[PDB]
Amino acid sequence: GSCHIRQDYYNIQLVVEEKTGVEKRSIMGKWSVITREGREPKLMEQINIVSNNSLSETYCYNRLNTSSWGRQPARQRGCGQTVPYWPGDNVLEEQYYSTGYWVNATGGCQLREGVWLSRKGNVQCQRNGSSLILQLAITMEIPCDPVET
Ligand SMILES: *[C@@H]1O[C@H](CO)[C@@H](O[C@@H]2O[C@H](CO)[C@@H](O)[C@H](O)[C@H]2NC(C)=O)[C@H](O)[C@H]1NC(C)=O
Ligand SMILES: *[C@@H]1O[C@H](CO)[C@@H](O)[C@H](O)[C@H]1NC(C)=O
Ligand SMILES: *[C@@H]1O[C@H](CO)[C@@H](O)[C@H](O)[C@H]1NC(C)=O
């Protein structure tokens, strides 16, 4: 994925174990939470590179299958929409965990069976005040609440 070298202003404080998902306070690990100035925190993989004719490190927002973590995200996003996680949701393109980081996930934009998070979809609804648009496959449960209060 997108890679960026560590800058001296980065204050890396959180590492996550790839398979187990254990979070620990540390400055250094294979998967670390990186917050580039202004940007959302992201879990990034340390990768070996050649840069300016020398061996080095960089950090890349690479895909990570979080199934073995055995814990759910607080939000997910895919196909240009970000939604709260509701139990029953499928894995989307990225997952946000409550300690505070996005993970590049292994899913897509199918939120439930036959229900896609699609900006050009046919159903508008909300989850906890957050607006979303769904595309439904051809009864069908709508996994969200009406916009009317
Ligand atoms: C999640 O990570 C994957 C790689 O693990 C990213 O996919 C690659 O993105 C780069 C550009 O950044 C392309 O050159 C590659 O062809 C893509 N595929 C692979 C298999 O490497 C993906 O873009 C990342 N997703 C997000 C949302 O950042
Ligand atoms: C992620 O891992 C789980 C457990 O091994 C597996 O069932 C699932 O298919 C994996 N997802 C992808 C996209 O490989
Ligand atoms: C979001 O809404 C659902 C259903 O309306 C509810 O079950 C859930 O507790 C809400 N979550 C929060 C954080 O309010």
PDB file of C-alpha atoms and ligand atoms in Angstrom, residues 86 127-128 145, ligand 3:
ATOM      1  CA  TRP A  86     -23.132  -2.984  13.874  1.00  0.00           C
ATOM      2  CA  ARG A 127     -26.834   4.591  11.963  1.00  0.00           C
ATOM      3  CA  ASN A 128     -26.544   6.544  15.211  1.00  0.00           C
ATOM      4  CA  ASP A 145     -32.563   3.208  10.709  1.00  0.00           C
TER       5      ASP A 145
HETATM    6  C1  LIG B   3     -26.804   2.787  17.473  1.00  0.00           C
HETATM    7  O1  LIG B   3     -28.169   2.488  17.139  1.00  0.00           O
HETATM    8  C2  LIG B   3     -28.539   1.127  17.405  1.00  0.00           C
HETATM    9  C3  LIG B   3     -29.951   0.943  16.893  1.00  0.00           C
HETATM   10  O2  LIG B   3     -30.608   2.185  16.681  1.00  0.00           O
HETATM   11  C4  LIG B   3     -28.396   0.836  18.896  1.00  0.00           C
HETATM   12  O3  LIG B   3     -28.707  -0.531  19.142  1.00  0.00           O
HETATM   13  C5  LIG B   3     -26.975   1.138  19.356  1.00  0.00           C
HETATM   14  O4  LIG B   3     -26.878   0.991  20.768  1.00  0.00           O
HETATM   15  C6  LIG B   3     -26.579   2.561  18.969  1.00  0.00           C
HETATM   16  N1  LIG B   3     -25.197   2.823  19.336  1.00  0.00           N
HETATM   17  C7  LIG B   3     -24.817   3.895  20.042  1.00  0.00           C
HETATM   18  C8  LIG B   3     -23.350   4.006  20.329  1.00  0.00           C
HETATM   19  O5  LIG B   3     -25.623   4.737  20.431  1.00  0.00           O
END
